[PDB]
Short mmCIF file of C-alpha atoms and ligand atoms in Angstrom, two decimals:
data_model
loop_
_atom_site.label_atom_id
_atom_site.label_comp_id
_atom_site.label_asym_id
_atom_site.label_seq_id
_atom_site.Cartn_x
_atom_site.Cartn_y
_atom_site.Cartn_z
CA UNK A 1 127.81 121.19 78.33
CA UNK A 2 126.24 121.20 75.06
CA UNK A 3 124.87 124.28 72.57
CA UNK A 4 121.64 125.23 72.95
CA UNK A 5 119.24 124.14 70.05
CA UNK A 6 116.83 125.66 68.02
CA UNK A 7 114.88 123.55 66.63
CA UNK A 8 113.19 122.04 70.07
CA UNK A 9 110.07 120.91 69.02
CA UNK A 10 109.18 119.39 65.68
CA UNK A 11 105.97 120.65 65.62
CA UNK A 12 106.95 124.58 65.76
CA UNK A 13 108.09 127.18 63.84
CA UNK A 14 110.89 129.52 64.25
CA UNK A 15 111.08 132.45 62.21
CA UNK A 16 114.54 132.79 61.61
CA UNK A 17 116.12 136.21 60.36
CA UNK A 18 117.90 136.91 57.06
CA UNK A 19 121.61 137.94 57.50
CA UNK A 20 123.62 137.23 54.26
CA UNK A 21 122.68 136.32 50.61
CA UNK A 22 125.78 135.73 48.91
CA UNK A 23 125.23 135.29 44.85
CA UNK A 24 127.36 132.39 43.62
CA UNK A 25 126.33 132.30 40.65
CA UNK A 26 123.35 133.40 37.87
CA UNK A 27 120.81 131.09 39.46
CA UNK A 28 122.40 129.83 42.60
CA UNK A 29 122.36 131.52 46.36
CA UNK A 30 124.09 131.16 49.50
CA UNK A 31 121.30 132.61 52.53
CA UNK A 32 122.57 132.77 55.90
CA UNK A 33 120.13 132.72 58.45
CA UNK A 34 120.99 134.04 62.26
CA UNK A 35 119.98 131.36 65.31
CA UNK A 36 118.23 132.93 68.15
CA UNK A 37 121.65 133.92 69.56
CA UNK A 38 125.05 133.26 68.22
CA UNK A 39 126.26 130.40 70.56
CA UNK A 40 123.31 128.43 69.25
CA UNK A 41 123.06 125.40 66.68
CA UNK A 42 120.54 124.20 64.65
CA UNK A 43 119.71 121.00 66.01
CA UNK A 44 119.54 118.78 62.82
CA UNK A 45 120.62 115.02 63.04
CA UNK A 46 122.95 113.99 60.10
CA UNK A 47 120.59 112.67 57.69
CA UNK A 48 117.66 115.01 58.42
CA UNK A 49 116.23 117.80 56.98
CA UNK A 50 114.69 121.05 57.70
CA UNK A 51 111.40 122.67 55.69
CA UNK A 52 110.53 125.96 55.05
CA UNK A 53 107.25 127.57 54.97
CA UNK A 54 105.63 130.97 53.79
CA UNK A 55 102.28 132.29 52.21
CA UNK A 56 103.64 133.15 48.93
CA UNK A 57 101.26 135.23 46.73
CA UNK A 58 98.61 134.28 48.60
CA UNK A 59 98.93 130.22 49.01
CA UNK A 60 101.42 128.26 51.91
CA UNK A 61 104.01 127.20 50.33
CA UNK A 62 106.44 123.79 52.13
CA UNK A 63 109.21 122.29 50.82
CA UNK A 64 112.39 120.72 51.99
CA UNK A 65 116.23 122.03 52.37
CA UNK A 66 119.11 120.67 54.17
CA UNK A 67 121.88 122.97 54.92
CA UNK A 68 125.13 123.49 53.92
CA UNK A 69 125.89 124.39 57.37
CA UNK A 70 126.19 121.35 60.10
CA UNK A 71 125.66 121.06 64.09
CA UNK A 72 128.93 122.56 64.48
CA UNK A 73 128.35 125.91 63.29
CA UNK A 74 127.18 128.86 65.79
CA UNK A 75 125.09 131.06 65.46
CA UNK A 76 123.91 130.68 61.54
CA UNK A 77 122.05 128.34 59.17
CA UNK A 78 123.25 128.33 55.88
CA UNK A 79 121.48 127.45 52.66
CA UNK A 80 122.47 126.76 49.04
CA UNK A 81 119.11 127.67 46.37
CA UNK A 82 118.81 126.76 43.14
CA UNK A 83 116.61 129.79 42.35
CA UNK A 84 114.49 128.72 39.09
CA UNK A 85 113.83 131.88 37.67
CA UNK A 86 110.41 131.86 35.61
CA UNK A 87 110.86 132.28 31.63
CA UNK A 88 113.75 130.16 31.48
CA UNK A 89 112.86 126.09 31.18
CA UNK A 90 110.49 126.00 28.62
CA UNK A 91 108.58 122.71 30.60
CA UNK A 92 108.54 125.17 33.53
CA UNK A 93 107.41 128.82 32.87
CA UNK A 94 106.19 129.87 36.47
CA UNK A 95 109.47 128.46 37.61
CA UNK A 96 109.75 127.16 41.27
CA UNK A 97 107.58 129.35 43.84
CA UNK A 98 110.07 128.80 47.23
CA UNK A 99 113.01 129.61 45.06
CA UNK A 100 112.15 133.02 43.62
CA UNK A 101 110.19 133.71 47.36
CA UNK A 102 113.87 133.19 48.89
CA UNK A 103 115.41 134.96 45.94
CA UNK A 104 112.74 138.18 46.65
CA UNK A 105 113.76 138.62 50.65
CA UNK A 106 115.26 141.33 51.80
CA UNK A 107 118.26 141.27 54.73
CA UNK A 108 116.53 141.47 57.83
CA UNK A 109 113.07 139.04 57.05
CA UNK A 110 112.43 136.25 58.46
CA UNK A 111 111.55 133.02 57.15
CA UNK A 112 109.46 130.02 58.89
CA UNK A 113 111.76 126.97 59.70
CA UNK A 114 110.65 123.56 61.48
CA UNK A 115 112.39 120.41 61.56
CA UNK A 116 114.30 117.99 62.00
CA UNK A 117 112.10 115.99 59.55
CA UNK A 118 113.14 112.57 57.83
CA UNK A 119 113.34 108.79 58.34
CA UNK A 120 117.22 108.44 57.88
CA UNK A 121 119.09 108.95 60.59
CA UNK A 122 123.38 108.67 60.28
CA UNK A 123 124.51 107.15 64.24
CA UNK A 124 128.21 107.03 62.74
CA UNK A 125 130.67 104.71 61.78
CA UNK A 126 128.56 103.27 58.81
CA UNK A 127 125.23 102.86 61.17
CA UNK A 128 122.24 104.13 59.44
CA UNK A 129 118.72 104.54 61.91
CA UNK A 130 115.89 104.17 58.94
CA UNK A 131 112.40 104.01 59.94
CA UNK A 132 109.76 102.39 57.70
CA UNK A 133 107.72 105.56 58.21
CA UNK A 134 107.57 108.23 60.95
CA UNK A 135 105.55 106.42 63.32
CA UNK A 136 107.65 103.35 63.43
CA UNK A 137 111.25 102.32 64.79
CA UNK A 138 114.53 102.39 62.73
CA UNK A 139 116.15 99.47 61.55
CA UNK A 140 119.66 99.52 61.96
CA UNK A 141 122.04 98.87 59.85
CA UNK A 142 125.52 98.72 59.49
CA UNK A 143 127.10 99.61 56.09
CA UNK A 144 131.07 99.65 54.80
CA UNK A 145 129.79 101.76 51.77
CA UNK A 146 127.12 104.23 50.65
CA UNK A 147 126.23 104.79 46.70
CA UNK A 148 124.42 108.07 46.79
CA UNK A 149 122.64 109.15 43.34
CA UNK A 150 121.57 112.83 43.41
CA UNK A 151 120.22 114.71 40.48
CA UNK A 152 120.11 118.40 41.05
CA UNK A 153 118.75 119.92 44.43
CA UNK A 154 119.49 116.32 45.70
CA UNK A 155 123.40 116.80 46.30
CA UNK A 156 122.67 119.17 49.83
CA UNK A 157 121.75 115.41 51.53
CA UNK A 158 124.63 113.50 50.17
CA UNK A 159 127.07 116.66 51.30
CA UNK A 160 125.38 116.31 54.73
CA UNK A 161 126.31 112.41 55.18
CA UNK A 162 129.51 113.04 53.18
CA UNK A 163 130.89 115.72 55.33
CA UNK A 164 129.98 114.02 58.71
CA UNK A 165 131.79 111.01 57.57
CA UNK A 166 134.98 112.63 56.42
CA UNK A 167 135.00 114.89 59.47
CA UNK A 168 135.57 111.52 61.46
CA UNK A 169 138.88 110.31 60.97
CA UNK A 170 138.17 107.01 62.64
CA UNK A 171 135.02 106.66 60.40
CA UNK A 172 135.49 104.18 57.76
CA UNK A 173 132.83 103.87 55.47
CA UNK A 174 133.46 104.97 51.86
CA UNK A 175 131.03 106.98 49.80
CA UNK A 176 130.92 106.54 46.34
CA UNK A 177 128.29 109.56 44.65
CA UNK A 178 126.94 109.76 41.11
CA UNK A 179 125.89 113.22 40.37
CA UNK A 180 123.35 113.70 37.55
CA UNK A 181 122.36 118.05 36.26
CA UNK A 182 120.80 119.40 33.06
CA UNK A 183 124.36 120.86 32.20
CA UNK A 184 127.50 121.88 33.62
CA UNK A 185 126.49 125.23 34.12
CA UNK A 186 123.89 123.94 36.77
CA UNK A 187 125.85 121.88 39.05
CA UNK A 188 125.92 122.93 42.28
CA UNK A 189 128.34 122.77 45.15
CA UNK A 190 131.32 121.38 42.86
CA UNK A 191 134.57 123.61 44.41
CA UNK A 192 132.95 122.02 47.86
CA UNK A 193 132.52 118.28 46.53
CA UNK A 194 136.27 118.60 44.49
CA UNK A 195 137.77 119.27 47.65
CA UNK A 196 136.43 116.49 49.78
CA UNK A 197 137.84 114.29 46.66
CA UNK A 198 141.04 116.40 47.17
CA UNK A 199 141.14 115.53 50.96
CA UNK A 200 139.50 111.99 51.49
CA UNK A 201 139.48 110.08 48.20
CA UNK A 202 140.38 107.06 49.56
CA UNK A 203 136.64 107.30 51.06
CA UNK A 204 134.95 109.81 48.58
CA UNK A 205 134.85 108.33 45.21
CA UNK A 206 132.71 111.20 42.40
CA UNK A 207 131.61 111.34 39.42
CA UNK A 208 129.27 113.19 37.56
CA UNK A 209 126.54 113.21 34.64
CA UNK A 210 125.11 115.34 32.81
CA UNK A 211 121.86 115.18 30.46
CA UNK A 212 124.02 117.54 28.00
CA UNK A 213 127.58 117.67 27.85
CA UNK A 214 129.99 120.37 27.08
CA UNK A 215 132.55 120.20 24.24
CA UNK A 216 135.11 119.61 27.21
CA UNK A 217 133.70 116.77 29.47
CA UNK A 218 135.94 114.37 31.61
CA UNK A 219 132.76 112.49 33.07
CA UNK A 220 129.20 110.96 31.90
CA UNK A 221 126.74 112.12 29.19
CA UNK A 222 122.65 111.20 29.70
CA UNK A 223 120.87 109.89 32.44
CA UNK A 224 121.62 107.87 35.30
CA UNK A 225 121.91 104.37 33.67
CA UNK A 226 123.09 100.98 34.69
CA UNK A 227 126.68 101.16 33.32
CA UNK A 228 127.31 104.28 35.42
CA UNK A 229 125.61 102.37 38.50
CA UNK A 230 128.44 99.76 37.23
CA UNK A 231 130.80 101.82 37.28
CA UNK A 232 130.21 104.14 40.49
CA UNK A 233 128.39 102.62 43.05
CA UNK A 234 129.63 99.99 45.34
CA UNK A 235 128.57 96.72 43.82
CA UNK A 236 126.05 94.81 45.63
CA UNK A 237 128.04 92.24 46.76
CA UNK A 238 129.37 94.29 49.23
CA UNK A 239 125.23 95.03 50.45
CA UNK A 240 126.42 99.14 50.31
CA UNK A 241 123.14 101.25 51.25
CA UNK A 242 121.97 103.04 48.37
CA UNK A 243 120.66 106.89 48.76
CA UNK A 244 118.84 108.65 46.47
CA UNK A 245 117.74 111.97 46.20
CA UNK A 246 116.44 114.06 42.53
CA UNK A 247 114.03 114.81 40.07
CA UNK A 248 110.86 112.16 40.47
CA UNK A 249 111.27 111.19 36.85
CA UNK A 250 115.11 110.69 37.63
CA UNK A 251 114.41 108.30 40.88
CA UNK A 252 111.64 106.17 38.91
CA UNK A 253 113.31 105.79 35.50
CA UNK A 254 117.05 106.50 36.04
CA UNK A 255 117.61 105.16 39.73
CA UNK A 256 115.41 102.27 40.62
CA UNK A 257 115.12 100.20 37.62
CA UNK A 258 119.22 100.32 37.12
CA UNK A 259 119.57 99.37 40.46
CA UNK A 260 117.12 97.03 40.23
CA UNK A 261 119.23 95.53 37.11
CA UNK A 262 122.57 95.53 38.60
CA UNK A 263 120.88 93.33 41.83
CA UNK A 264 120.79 96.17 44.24
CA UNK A 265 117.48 94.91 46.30
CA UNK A 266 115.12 97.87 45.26
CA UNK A 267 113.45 97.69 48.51
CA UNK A 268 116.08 99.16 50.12
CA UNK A 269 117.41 101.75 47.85
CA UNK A 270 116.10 105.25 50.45
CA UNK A 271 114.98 108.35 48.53
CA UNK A 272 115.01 111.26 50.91
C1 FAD B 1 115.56 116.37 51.47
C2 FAD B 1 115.63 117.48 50.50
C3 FAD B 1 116.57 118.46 50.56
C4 FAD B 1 116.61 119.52 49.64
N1 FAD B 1 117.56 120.48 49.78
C5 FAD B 1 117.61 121.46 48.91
C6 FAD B 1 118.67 122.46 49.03
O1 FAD B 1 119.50 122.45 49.92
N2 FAD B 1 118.63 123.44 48.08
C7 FAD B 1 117.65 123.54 47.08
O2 FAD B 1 117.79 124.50 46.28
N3 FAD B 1 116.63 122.67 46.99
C8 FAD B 1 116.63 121.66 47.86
N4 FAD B 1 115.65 120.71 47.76
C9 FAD B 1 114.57 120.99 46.77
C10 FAD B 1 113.51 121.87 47.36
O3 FAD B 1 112.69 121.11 48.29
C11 FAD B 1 112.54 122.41 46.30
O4 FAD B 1 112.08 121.34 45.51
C12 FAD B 1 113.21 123.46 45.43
O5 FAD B 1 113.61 124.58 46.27
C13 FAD B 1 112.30 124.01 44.33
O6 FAD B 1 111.04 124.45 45.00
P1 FAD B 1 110.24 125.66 44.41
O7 FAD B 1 109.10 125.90 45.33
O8 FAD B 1 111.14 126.81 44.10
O9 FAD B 1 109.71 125.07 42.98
P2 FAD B 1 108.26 124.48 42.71
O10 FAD B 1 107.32 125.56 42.64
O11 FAD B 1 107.95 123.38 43.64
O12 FAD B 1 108.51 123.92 41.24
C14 FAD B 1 108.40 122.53 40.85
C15 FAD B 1 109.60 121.94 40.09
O13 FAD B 1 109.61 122.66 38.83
C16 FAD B 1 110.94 122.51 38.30
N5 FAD B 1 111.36 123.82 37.84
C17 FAD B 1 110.72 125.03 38.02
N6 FAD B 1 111.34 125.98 37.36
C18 FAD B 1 112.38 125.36 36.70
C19 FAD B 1 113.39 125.86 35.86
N7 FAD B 1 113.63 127.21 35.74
N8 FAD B 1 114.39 124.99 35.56
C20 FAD B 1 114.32 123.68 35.86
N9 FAD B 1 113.33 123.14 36.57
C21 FAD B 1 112.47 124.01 37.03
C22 FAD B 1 111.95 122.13 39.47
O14 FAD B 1 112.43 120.79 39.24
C23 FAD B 1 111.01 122.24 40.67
O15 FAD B 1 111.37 121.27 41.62
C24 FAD B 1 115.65 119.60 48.60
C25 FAD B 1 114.69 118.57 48.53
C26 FAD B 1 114.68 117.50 49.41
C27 FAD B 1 113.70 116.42 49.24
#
């Protein structure tokens, strides 16, 4: 027998309850969110995402998260929030509206969630399901590596496909990630990505940028750039699938024109 899922029906929401907010640091979050009963599972296909929706001063408010947590978890949905506090980026004053909502609830509300939502689907053992758009049928193909840029918010996909590849011992496919943040201070999820290096390097290769560096830096200064695509992504003469996930300004000046250079085919480079 399997769990039972929650997420059923794409086209519903399920109000799911506040349990735990764990504060990991200034501006980050941890919220735990109960199932409908504690011997269920989400229901969210490795490469998918969930959304999340509320009226928020007035106005519905969507946007896209995908958990820390996986299908084998009971019971609890866990996600990691980059809360961006108003007052603080000088190119952002409102700061983010879902953020500071999730950052405002109180243990015991609930919080719309529907899903699974996306057009990548991960089958295993380096087989990808893609679909053109939603109303179309996946191509699939077969991979022996995955570069995976992520700027920011983007790491929680690349965790997702990371972690269900390590999990599976008999899974070969090496992942090579490029991680791009304002600073050092704002990375997230780096204890979590240091010890899948620590476990499974011989299949997790990482490195990080950052836009500004501090005085003691081991990695990459600026932006995503061809060198760095050089120099940590699969080459592509080995045809590695190439995921994406940041900032838009990141995927359209950073991303695609570097892969573009290095002879990645641009066509195929996904952004979730
Ligand atoms: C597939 C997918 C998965 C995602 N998973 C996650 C996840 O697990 N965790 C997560 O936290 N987010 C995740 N995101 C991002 C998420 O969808 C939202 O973009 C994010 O929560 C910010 O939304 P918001 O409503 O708070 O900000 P909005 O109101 O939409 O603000 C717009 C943009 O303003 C910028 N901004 C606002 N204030 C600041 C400031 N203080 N500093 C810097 N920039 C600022 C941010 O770049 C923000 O995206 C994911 C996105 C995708 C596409």
């Amino acid at each position: 027998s399997t769990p039972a899922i929650t997420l059923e029906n794409p086209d519903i929401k399920y109000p799911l309850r506040l349990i735990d907010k764990e504060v990991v640091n200034h501006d980050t979050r941890r919220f735990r969110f109960a199932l409908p009963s504690p011997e269920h599972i989400l229901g969210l296909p490795v490469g998918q995402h969930i959304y999340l929706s509320a009226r928020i001063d007035g106005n519905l408010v969507i946007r896209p998260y995908t958990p820390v947590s996986s299908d084998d978890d009971k019971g609890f949905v866990d996600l990691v929030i980059k809360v961006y506090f108003k007052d603080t980026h000088p190119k952002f004053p409102a700061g983010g509206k879902m953020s500071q909502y999730l950052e405002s609830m109180k243990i015991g509300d609930t919080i719309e969630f529907r899903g699974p939502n996306g057009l990548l689907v991960y089958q295993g053992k380096g087989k990808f399901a893609i679909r053109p758009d939603k109303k179309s049928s996946p191509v699939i193909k077969t991979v022996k590596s995955v570069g995976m840029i992520a700027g920011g918010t983007g790491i929680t996909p690349m965790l997702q496909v990371i972690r269900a590849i390590m999990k599976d011992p008999d899974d070969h496919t090496v992942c090579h990630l490029l991680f791009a943040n304002q600073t050092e201070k704002d990375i997230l999820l780096r204890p979590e990505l240091e010890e899948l290096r620590n476990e499974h390097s011989a299949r997790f290769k990482l490195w990080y940028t950052v836009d500004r560096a501090p005085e003691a830096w081991d990695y990459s200064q600026g932006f995503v750039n061809e060198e760095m695509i050089r120099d940590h992504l699969p080459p592509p003469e080995e045809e590695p699938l190439v995921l994406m996930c940041g900032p838009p300004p990141m995927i359209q000046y950073a991303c695609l024109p570097n892969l573009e250079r290095v002879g990645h085919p641009k066509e195929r480079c996904f952004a979730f």
